[PDB]
Design a protein around this ligand. Structure first.
Ligand SMILES: O=C(O)C[C@@H](Cc1ccccc1)C(=O)SCC(=O)c1ccccc1
Ligand code: NI
Ligand code: NI
Length: 159
């Protein structure tokens, strides 16, 4: 089932989400399936559960980036190197900005069946994971913009 994506300004995007405690369950598998469908219908490359008003540490992502469902994610930078790049948000439709993110990270958590996930990622892969992770702690990308000249509507931006 395709779910409604809530828009920036909804208080529910500002919450710090609790952990998933139903790994391996039918309930979690159906929510994840819904998230992939939803992300797919909106043409996203990532979607966090708070964006469909589900208060859980859960994201889906991938596109080149392997299709992944990640519960209880933890991230750690693998160096201090930052990189700028374009980001948009399905909860902020039409807009984009340039945002600095760690170029290199490791992320860990669990697949929806309960098996552990732990990966090194770089570049766009790493950026997507950082972006979704931010949702789980009630943070959106405008609060990370450094250069406001880059923030604007997709169809008009020239930077
Ligand atoms: O809205 C989210 O939390 C999903 C989001 C993820 C994202 C894209 C690019 C960089 C970081 C995070 C989107 O998929 S935005 C919608 C979109 O069509 C898009 C934007 C930029 C690049 C590729 C796709
Ligand atoms: Ni369907
Ligand atoms: Ni470098």
């Amino acid at each position: 089932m395709i779910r409604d994506i809530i828009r920036m300004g909804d208080k529910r995007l500002l919450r710090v989400a609790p952990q998933v405690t139903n790994l391996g369950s039918a309930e979690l598998h159906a929510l994840v399936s819904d998230m992939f469908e939803t992300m797919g219908a909106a043409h996203g490359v990532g979607l966090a559960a708070p964006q469909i008003a589900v208060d859980l540490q859960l994201m889906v992502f991938g596109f080149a980036v392997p299709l992944t469902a990640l519960a209880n994610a933890q991230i750690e930078p693998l160096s201090d190197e930052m990189e700028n790049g374009w980001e948009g948000c399905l909860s902020i439709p039409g807009l984009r900005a340039v945002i600095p993110r760690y170029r290199y990270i490791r992320y860990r958590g669990f697949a929806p069946d309960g098996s552990p996930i732990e990966r090194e990622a770089e570049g766009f892969h790493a950026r997507v994971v950082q972006h979704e992770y931010d949702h789980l702690v009630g943070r959106l990308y405008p609060s990370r913009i450094e250069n406001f000249d880059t923030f604007g509507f997709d169809d008009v931006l020239s930077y």
